[PDB]
Amino acid sequence: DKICLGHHAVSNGTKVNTLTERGVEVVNATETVERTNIPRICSKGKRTVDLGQCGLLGTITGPPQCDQFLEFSADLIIERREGSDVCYPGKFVNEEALRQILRESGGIDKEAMGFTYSGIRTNGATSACRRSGSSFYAEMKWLLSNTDNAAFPQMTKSYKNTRKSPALIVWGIHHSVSTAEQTKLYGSGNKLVTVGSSNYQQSFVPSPGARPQVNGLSGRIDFHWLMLNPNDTVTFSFNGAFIAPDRASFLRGKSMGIQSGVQVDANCEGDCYHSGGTIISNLPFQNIDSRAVGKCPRYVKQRSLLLATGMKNVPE
Amino acid sequence: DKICLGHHAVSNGTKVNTLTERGVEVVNATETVERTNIPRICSKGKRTVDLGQCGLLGTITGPPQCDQFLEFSADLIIERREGSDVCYPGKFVNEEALRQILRESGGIDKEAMGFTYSGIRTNGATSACRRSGSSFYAEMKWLLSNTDNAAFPQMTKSYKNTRKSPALIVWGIHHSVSTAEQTKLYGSGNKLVTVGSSNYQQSFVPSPGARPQVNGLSGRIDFHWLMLNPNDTVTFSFNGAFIAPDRASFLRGKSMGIQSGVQVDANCEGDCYHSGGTIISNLPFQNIDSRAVGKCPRYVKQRSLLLATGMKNVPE
Amino acid sequence: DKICLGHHAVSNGTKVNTLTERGVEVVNATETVERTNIPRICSKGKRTVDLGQCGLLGTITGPPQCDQFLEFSADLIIERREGSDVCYPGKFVNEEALRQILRESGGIDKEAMGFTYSGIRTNGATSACRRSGSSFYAEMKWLLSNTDNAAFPQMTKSYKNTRKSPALIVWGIHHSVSTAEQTKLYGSGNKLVTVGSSNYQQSFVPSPGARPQVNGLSGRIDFHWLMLNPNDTVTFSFNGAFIAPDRASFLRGKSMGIQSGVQVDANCEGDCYHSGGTIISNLPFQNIDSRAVGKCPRYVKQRSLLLATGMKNVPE
Amino acid sequence: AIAGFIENGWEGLIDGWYGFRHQNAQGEGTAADYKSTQSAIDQITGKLNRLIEKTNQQFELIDNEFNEVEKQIGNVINWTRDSITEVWSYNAELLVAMENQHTIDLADSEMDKLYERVKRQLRENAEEDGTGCFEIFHKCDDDCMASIRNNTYDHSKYREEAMQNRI
Amino acid sequence: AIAGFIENGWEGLIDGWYGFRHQNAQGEGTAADYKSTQSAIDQITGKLNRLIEKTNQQFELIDNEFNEVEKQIGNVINWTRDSITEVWSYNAELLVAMENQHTIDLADSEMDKLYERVKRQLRENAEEDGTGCFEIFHKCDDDCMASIRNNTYDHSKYREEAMQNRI
Amino acid sequence: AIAGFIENGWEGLIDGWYGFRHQNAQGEGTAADYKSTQSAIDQITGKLNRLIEKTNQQFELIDNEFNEVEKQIGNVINWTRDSITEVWSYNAELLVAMENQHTIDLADSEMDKLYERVKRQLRENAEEDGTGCFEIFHKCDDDCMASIRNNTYDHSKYREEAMQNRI
Ligand SMILES: *[C@@H]1O[C@H](CO[C@@H]2O[C@@H](C)[C@@H](O)[C@@H](O)[C@@H]2O)[C@@H](O[C@@H]2O[C@H](CO)[C@@H](O[C@@H]3O[C@H](CO)[C@@H](O)[C@H](O)[C@@H]3O)[C@H](O)[C@H]2NC(C)=O)[C@H](O)[C@H]1NC(C)=O
Ligand SMILES: *[C@@H]1O[C@H](CO)[C@@H](O[C@@H]2O[C@H](CO)[C@@H](O[C@@H]3O[C@H](CO)[C@@H](O)[C@H](O)[C@@H]3O)[C@H](O)[C@H]2NC(C)=O)[C@H](O)[C@H]1NC(C)=O
Ligand SMILES: *[C@@H]1O[C@H](CO)[C@@H](O[C@@H]2O[C@H](CO)[C@@H](O[C@@H]3O[C@H](CO)[C@@H](O)[C@H](O)[C@@H]3O)[C@H](O)[C@H]2NC(C)=O)[C@H](O)[C@H]1NC(C)=O
Ligand SMILES: *[C@@H]1O[C@H](CO)[C@@H](O[C@@H]2O[C@H](CO)[C@@H](O)[C@H](O)[C@H]2NC(C)=O)[C@H](O)[C@H]1NC(C)=O
Ligand SMILES: *[C@@H]1O[C@H](CO)[C@@H](O)[C@H](O)[C@H]1NC(C)=O
Ligand SMILES: *[C@@H]1O[C@H](CO)[C@@H](O)[C@H](O)[C@H]1NC(C)=O
Ligand SMILES: *[C@@H]1O[C@H](CO)[C@@H](O)[C@H](O)[C@H]1NC(C)=O
Ligand SMILES: [Ca+2]
Ligand SMILES: [Ca+2]
Ligand SMILES: [Ca+2]
C-alpha cells in the first residue's frame, strides 16, 4: 500500500522570467504593467473646468474667448489645443511658470485695483478683440493720449495688496508697428514704463517696428506678471505704451491642470491623466504615457512584466 | 532517553515586514531610517562664519551689517533669515547663481581696483546706510556730478585681473525716483553705462520713476556682476547713474554653505545639515528633511523601516 | 564499499561579496563594471565629421575655418577644443541649446532667404575674417549706411518657411567700440533691431563702448537664433547694427554629437563615447566617465563589482 | 502507476495546491491538503498586497505638449525624465524576476515541508520510493489513510507488523 | 514534556541562538551550540556592515528657503527631487523586506543544518520523533549527551544495543 | 581516506561541477555527473543573459566640457547627475551582492538534490556516514557503482544481503 504527496499542475501554463531563466512556466501569473487606457477624462468627484478656446493665461487678461472664466473655480483644469491666451497679438513673458502657477491654483478671484485716469483716453480698442464690435482685453485698459499725437502725461499708479494671499498682477507693453503709430497713440518722444514693488523692479521700453500680420495686425502687446506679497505695494510709472491692469487675481486653493484632446466623463473617477485619457489601475507600473500626471503607476519602457501568482508548472 | 534541537525565543518580539508578510515577529530588529535631529549646527573641526544680519551677497558690496565679513574665510558658511544684502534698496541681478558661487567659495579676498576720479563728486551717501551718520556701501562709490544739476563728464575706467584666478566684479546702476532727482545727481540728458570685457558686453540705462518706499526711499540700486578671467580687463564707460566698485573679490578655496535658524555648537561634529540642525547618523536613510545637505543618509518618505537582526520569534 | 557525492574546487579561488559576507571565495567570477577604454573614436559604420578648427555653431554663420562644412552631412559629429564659432569677436546667445540642436541634426542644408537691398552698402568686411584679404562670414551680410555717417534707412525684410521642416534662422547685432564708430557705420541716433514671427518677438539694441581688443579688435558681433515653423514667416525690422542672414538652415535627419580630444578610427565600431575615447562593452556598468554618451553602460562610482559565475570554493 | 511530486504535478488535483494520493485494497484516491495550500496562497496574497500598491505622490506637468518649452530647459527635463525611466524600468524588471524566483522556491519548499511531515508521522512503518511516495509496510485502509492525512496516524499501532514486513 | 524547534522556540535558551535540550535519568538540561550561533550572528553582522554605510557624496543647496528661486527652475528642481525621493523610498522598503525574508530563512537554515548534523552522528541508534528531537535507543548519560553536543559521539559503541532495542 | 561535499570540495574533479567518488575492491575512482553540472551551468548562463544586457536608451550631452554652461543650470544638472549616480551605484552593489548569494545557494541546492537522489536509489542498502558518502552494505563492483551513477541501480537485487549486513 502507498501514499504519495503531490502538487497541482495545469495544461495551460503561463511563462514568466526569474533570476536564472527566461520563460519558466507557472500555474498562474498577473500583469504588473498597465496598458489599458480609458480615452476620457474621468472627472467624477471633481469640479472640472474645460477651457475650450480659452487659453489658460487668457483667464487673467480676458480676451473674448475667456469671458466665462474670468473668475473660474476648479479642482481639475483642462487645457485644449485650440486654446488662445490672446486677441491682440503678442504673448506672455515667462509664460510657462505662470501656466504652472495657474494649473494648481484652484482658479482665481479677481479684485478691482482702483486706478482712475485723467488727461488721457482709456478706450483703446481693436477689431482683433471682437465683442459688440471692436473691443479689448476685459481686464486691461489700453491707455492713449487724449488726442492723436498729443503728449501723454507722466503718470504713476499704485496698488496695495490688502489680502492675506499673494496677488497676481499683470500688465502689458505695446510695441507699435512703427515710430509713426507710436507717436499717433502716445505722443512723440522716448517711452518708458517702470514697475516696482518692495521685491521687484524692472523697466520696459517699447520697440516699434514691423512684424508679420497676425489677425491682420503687425503690432504686439507683450504681457508681464509678478506676485505681489500681502501688505506690499506695486507702483507703475509710465508715459505711454502701457496696457494697464483693471484688476488683480488671487488664487483660490488647490487644483491639478492637464492638457488633453479627449472628452470629459463625470461618471468615472480617476487620478492619473494624460492627454489621451485616464489611467485607472492599481498596478505599480504603466507603459501608456511617460508624461502622465496626478497619482500614477510609474512609467516603464516594457510593455509587459508578469508576476507569478502560482508555483512552477510541471505537467505530465 | 532523548535529545532535542531548538532555538531561542523571547516574549518581547518585534514586528517587521518581509516579502510575503506584514508584521512577522522577530527576536530582534534595528531602525534603518533616522528621525533623531540635533537642533544645533555641529561645527566642530570647521572654521565657521555665522553671517547674522549680513546677507551673503552683502559681503561683496559691504552694507554696514556686513562690515566684519568683507574678507571672510570659512569652511562652513551659515546664512540667517534676518540677513540682508542691502542698505540702499535694490537687489542683485542673477542673484541665486552668485549665492551658489559664494557658498562654496571658502570666503573672499578683496583687491583694490585702483580707480581714481576728477571733475566729479565721489561722496554720495544715504541715511539708509548708517555708520557715523549717512554713509554708503563700503566697497562701492556713489559717483555724482560736481554740483547739483551740473553735467557729468563722460568717463572710462578699466581694471585688469593680474591674478591666476577669476575676479568677481560687481557694479551698480542707480534708478532715481524721478527724472528731476536723476538730473540733480548726474545732470540732465540721457544716461548710459556700458561694461565690457573680452567675453562680455552690456549696456544699462537707468530708469527713473516712483517705486514704493523701502527704508523711506523710493530709489533703487541694482547690482550686476561678472567673472573676470585671469589676464582679462573689464572696462566701464559711463556718464552717471553708476555705482562704481572700489575692489574686486577673489574666492579663497572650498566651503559648504547652509541656511539655518538654530545655534552653532562648536563642541559637536557633523556633516549633514538642514535648517533645523544636524543629522548625526550612520543609518542609510532619514525622514527629517528632504533638503538636508552635506554628506547625508538618503531622504525617504517613510518614518520607519525595521531591519531584522534576529530569527523569527516563535514563543510558546 | 562506499560512494561519495562531491563538487569541484580550485586552488585559485576569487573573492566576491554577498548579502552576508565580504570576500567569500567562489570557483569563478566576472567583472560587472567596465574600466577598459579604447582611446579612439570608433566610427565604423557611421558618416563621421571631424570639425577640427570649425566650431559647430560656425557651420551656420560661416567663418573661414568652417567653409568646408556649410552644408555638412553626418551620423556622428565631433567637436574639438581648437574649434571656434567666430572670426570677428563675439559669440552666440543661447549657445548651448543651439549646440544641442545641431549635434542631433544629421547636418544642415542651406537655403537662400532671398533678401535684397537698396540705399545701403552690403560689403562690410574685416581683417579678422581672412580669405583673399579681408572678408566676412560666408552666410551673413554686414549692412552699412551708403556712406560714412549717412542715415541708414528704416528697413523691413521677411522670409517665409515654405518647407515641411523648421528652419533655423540666425542673425547678428554689431556692438561698435564707440558711439562715434556706430555713427560712422550706421548714421547717428538710436539703433534698434526687431525680430518677429508668429511665436517669437524680441528687440535688440546695440551697446557701443570700449572694451578689450580681441584679435586687435574691440568691436563684437553677437549671434541670435530662432526655429521658424513650416508655413510661418520671420520679419526683421532694423535701422543699422544688423548682420543679416543670406541663408536659412534645415536639419537633415539624425545624428549624435560628441566632444573629443582623441583620433577617429573608422575600423572599430562603437556606440558609447566620451572625450577620451569609446567604451566598447556589454557590461551593465562603467566607471570610466560619468558624462559618456550614446548607448552606454550606466556610470557607477565603484571601480569593481564581481559577479559570481560558480559555486563557493571549498578547498582542502 | 501512482507517483508523487518528484516526477511531476497532478493535473487532476483541482481542489488545492498540494495533496495526497493513495493506493490500497479499496482503490486509489486523491485529497487536497488545506493547510499547506492556504499557507502558500497567503504568502502570494502577501506579495500581491505589497506589489499592487499605488504611489500617493502627486506629480504635475513641467512640460508643455501644445507650446514647446524653451530648448535648454526642455532638454534638461527630457534628460532627467529619461534617466528616471531607465531607473524604474530596471527596478520593475528586477522586482519581477526576483519575486518570481522567490515565489517558485517558496512553493517547492511548502511541498517539501508537507512531505517531511508525513515521513516523520510514518517513522519506521514506511520507506521512500524516490518519486515522492511512501511504500507503507502494513495494510492501510481508507480510515488509516485519512489518519495520515489529518495528522493522527499513530505509528506505534502498526510498528510490529510493519518492521517485520520490512524484513 | 520536552520538544524541539518544529513546535516552537525556547524562551529559556538565553546563552545562544541554537541549542540542545536532553532528557535522561539524570534529568533535563539545555546547552547552547556556540558554532551555529556564531555562524548566524556573523551573517547578520555582515548584513549590518553593508547596510549601515554612509554615502561619501556631498550635495549642496540648489534651492533657497529664505528667498524663493524663480518659479520655472523651482518646479523643475522640485519635480526632480520628488522623483528621486520616490526612487529611494521604494529602494528602502524593498531593501528591508528582501533582507528580512533572507534573514529569517537563513536562521531556519542554520537550525536545519544543526539538526541534520546530529541526525547523521546518531546514525542507526536514534529515530526522529517529529518535534525536532531524537529518541535515543540506548542509555545516554550526561557524558554521552555531551559527546553528541561536541561531535565525538561514536555510534559504533552503542549500535548493537540500540538496533536490538529498535526491535 | 575518501570523503564527500560536507567536508570540502574536490580539486581533482575537473570534468564537472558535481560528481561521484567511490571505493571498492577494484580501487577508487571519480566521475562527473553531467546532468546536475549542466543544470547549474544553465542557471548561471540564465543570470548572465539577464545581467550582461545593454541599455537601448540613447543619451545626449546636456553639458559642455570646453565652454562651461551658465552656473545656475550647471548646478542643477550636476545635482541631478550625482543623484542618478548614487542610485546606480547603490543598485549595482545590491544587484551583485544579491545575485552572488543566490548563485551560491543555488549551487549548494543542486548538490543536495543529487545527494538526496542517490540516497533514495540506495533505499535500505546503505547508510550515510555524515561526510556526504554512503556506506554500502554489500559488495558493489565497478558495474554496480556505474549503475548508481546512471540511475539504474535496483535496490531489490541487493536488499536481502544488505539488510542482513546492517545487523
Ligand atoms: C582559475 O583557473 C583556470 C586555469 O588557468 C590557466 O591555467 C594556466 C595556463 C595558468 O598559468 C593560467 O594563466 C591560465 O589562465 C581558468 O581558466 C583558463 O582561462 C584561460 C584565460 O582566460 C584560458 O585561456 C584561453 O586560451 C585560448 C588560446 O590560448 C584563448 O583563445 C582564449 O581567449 C583563452 O584566454 C584557458 O583555456 C583556461 N584554462 C583551461 C585549462 O581551460 C579560470 O577561469 C580561473 N579563474 C577565473 C576567475 O578566471
Ligand atoms: C490567478 O491569478 C490571480 C492572482 O493575482 C487571481 O485573481 C485575483 O484574485 C484576487 C482575490 O481572489 C482579486 O482581489 C480582488 O481585488 C478587488 C480590487 O479592489 C477587491 O475589491 C476584491 O475584494 C478582491 O479581493 C484580484 O483582483 C485578482 N487579480 C486580478 C489581476 O484580477 C486569479 O483568480 C487566479 N486564478 C486562480 C484559478 O486562482
Ligand atoms: C569563468 O566565467 C567567465 C565569465 O563568465 C567565463 O567566460 C565566459 O564564457 C561565456 C560562455 O562560454 C562567454 O560567452 C561567449 O561570448 C560570445 C557572446 O555570447 C559568443 O561569441 C560565444 O559563442 C560565447 O557565448 C563569455 O564571453 C565569457 N566571458 C568572458 C568575460 O570571458 C569562463 O569561461 C569561466 N571559466 C571557467 C573555467 O568556467
Ligand atoms: C539587537 O540588535 C541591535 C542592533 O544591531 C544590537 O545593537 C548593536 O550592537 C552592535 C555590535 O554588536 C553595536 O556596534 C551597535 O552599537 C548596536 N546598534 C544599535 C543600533 O544600537 C543589540 O545588541 C541587539 N540586542 C541583543 C540583546 O542582541
Ligand atoms: C523632449 O521630449 C519630447 C518627447 O516627450 C519631444 O517631443 C521633445 O521634442 C523633446 N525635446 C527636445 C528639445 O528634443
Ligand atoms: C518647491 O518645494 C517647496 C517644498 O519643498 C515649496 O515650498 C516651494 O513652493 C516649491 N516651489 C513651487 C514653485 O511650487
Ligand atoms: C559640474 O560638474 C563638473 C564635473 O563634471 C565641474 O567641472 C563643474 O565645475 C561643475 N559645475 C559647477 C557649476 O560647479
Ligand atoms: Ca472677485
Ligand atoms: Ca586682500
Ligand atoms: Ca542647399
mmCIF file of C-alpha atoms in Angstrom, chain B residues 201-284:
data_model
loop_
_atom_site.group_PDB
_atom_site.id
_atom_site.type_symbol
_atom_site.label_atom_id
_atom_site.label_comp_id
_atom_site.label_asym_id
_atom_site.label_seq_id
_atom_site.Cartn_x
_atom_site.Cartn_y
_atom_site.Cartn_z
ATOM 1 C CA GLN B 201 29.425 93.480 -23.204
ATOM 2 C CA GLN B 202 26.238 95.017 -21.971
ATOM 3 C CA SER B 203 24.553 98.375 -21.783
ATOM 4 C CA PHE B 204 22.491 99.795 -18.908
ATOM 5 C CA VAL B 205 20.138 102.757 -18.950
ATOM 6 C CA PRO B 206 18.804 103.953 -15.605
ATOM 7 C CA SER B 207 15.043 104.140 -15.442
ATOM 8 C CA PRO B 208 13.847 106.721 -13.070
ATOM 9 C CA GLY B 209 10.358 106.592 -11.574
ATOM 10 C CA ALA B 210 8.455 106.131 -8.397
ATOM 11 C CA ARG B 211 8.759 102.741 -6.568
ATOM 12 C CA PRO B 212 7.310 102.050 -3.056
ATOM 13 C CA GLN B 213 9.401 103.334 -0.149
ATOM 14 C CA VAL B 214 11.758 100.748 1.236
ATOM 15 C CA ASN B 215 13.574 102.195 4.276
ATOM 16 C CA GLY B 216 11.897 105.566 3.474
ATOM 17 C CA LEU B 217 13.485 105.501 -0.060
ATOM 18 C CA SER B 218 11.892 105.131 -3.439
ATOM 19 C CA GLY B 219 15.041 104.872 -5.499
ATOM 20 C CA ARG B 220 16.748 101.545 -6.263
ATOM 21 C CA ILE B 221 20.324 100.463 -6.820
ATOM 22 C CA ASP B 222 20.593 97.241 -8.657
ATOM 23 C CA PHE B 223 23.761 95.228 -8.623
ATOM 24 C CA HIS B 224 25.301 93.298 -11.518
ATOM 25 C CA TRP B 225 28.244 91.001 -11.575
ATOM 26 C CA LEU B 226 30.635 89.105 -13.840
ATOM 27 C CA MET B 227 33.609 86.791 -13.511
ATOM 28 C CA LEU B 228 36.719 88.391 -14.999
ATOM 29 C CA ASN B 229 39.259 85.819 -16.300
ATOM 30 C CA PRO B 230 42.965 85.862 -15.431
ATOM 31 C CA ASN B 231 44.772 88.407 -17.604
ATOM 32 C CA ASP B 232 41.466 89.892 -18.982
ATOM 33 C CA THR B 233 40.332 93.525 -18.485
ATOM 34 C CA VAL B 234 36.902 94.949 -17.594
ATOM 35 C CA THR B 235 36.137 98.440 -18.869
ATOM 36 C CA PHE B 236 33.318 100.641 -17.632
ATOM 37 C CA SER B 237 32.110 103.626 -19.658
ATOM 38 C CA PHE B 238 29.507 105.937 -18.172
ATOM 39 C CA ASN B 239 28.159 109.455 -17.743
ATOM 40 C CA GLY B 240 26.197 108.948 -14.499
ATOM 41 C CA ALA B 241 23.874 106.679 -12.532
ATOM 42 C CA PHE B 242 26.857 104.440 -11.916
ATOM 43 C CA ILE B 243 27.787 102.926 -8.609
ATOM 44 C CA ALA B 244 31.433 102.039 -9.064
ATOM 45 C CA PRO B 245 33.363 99.213 -7.457
ATOM 46 C CA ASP B 246 36.352 100.126 -5.286
ATOM 47 C CA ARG B 247 37.518 96.493 -5.015
ATOM 48 C CA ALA B 248 37.367 93.102 -6.729
ATOM 49 C CA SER B 249 36.833 89.787 -4.930
ATOM 50 C CA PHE B 250 38.764 86.502 -5.314
ATOM 51 C CA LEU B 251 37.481 83.222 -3.974
ATOM 52 C CA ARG B 252 39.654 81.593 -1.366
ATOM 53 C CA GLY B 253 39.204 77.816 -1.606
ATOM 54 C CA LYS B 254 36.367 75.472 -0.660
ATOM 55 C CA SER B 255 33.398 75.609 1.730
ATOM 56 C CA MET B 256 29.848 74.485 2.190
ATOM 57 C CA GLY B 257 27.007 76.912 2.779
ATOM 58 C CA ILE B 258 23.771 76.347 4.676
ATOM 59 C CA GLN B 259 20.678 78.169 5.696
ATOM 60 C CA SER B 260 19.658 77.808 9.312
ATOM 61 C CA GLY B 261 17.556 79.022 12.258
ATOM 62 C CA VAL B 262 19.380 77.294 15.148
ATOM 63 C CA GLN B 263 22.605 78.000 17.089
ATOM 64 C CA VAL B 264 26.099 76.883 16.300
ATOM 65 C CA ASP B 265 27.737 74.338 18.576
ATOM 66 C CA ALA B 266 31.488 74.056 18.192
ATOM 67 C CA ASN B 267 31.631 71.089 20.567
ATOM 68 C CA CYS B 268 29.739 68.526 18.360
ATOM 69 C CA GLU B 269 30.976 67.282 14.978
ATOM 70 C CA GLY B 270 28.737 66.652 11.990
ATOM 71 C CA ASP B 271 28.442 66.623 8.238
ATOM 72 C CA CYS B 272 24.742 66.576 7.380
ATOM 73 C CA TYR B 273 22.823 69.825 7.923
ATOM 74 C CA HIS B 274 19.430 71.278 7.444
ATOM 75 C CA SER B 275 17.757 74.444 8.661
ATOM 76 C CA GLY B 276 16.613 72.869 11.947
ATOM 77 C CA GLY B 277 20.015 71.321 12.844
ATOM 78 C CA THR B 278 22.408 68.466 12.266
ATOM 79 C CA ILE B 279 21.626 64.866 11.404
ATOM 80 C CA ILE B 280 24.291 62.708 13.103
ATOM 81 C CA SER B 281 23.681 59.187 11.985
ATOM 82 C CA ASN B 282 25.132 56.149 10.245
ATOM 83 C CA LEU B 283 21.741 54.950 9.121
ATOM 84 C CA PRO B 284 21.359 54.780 5.371
#
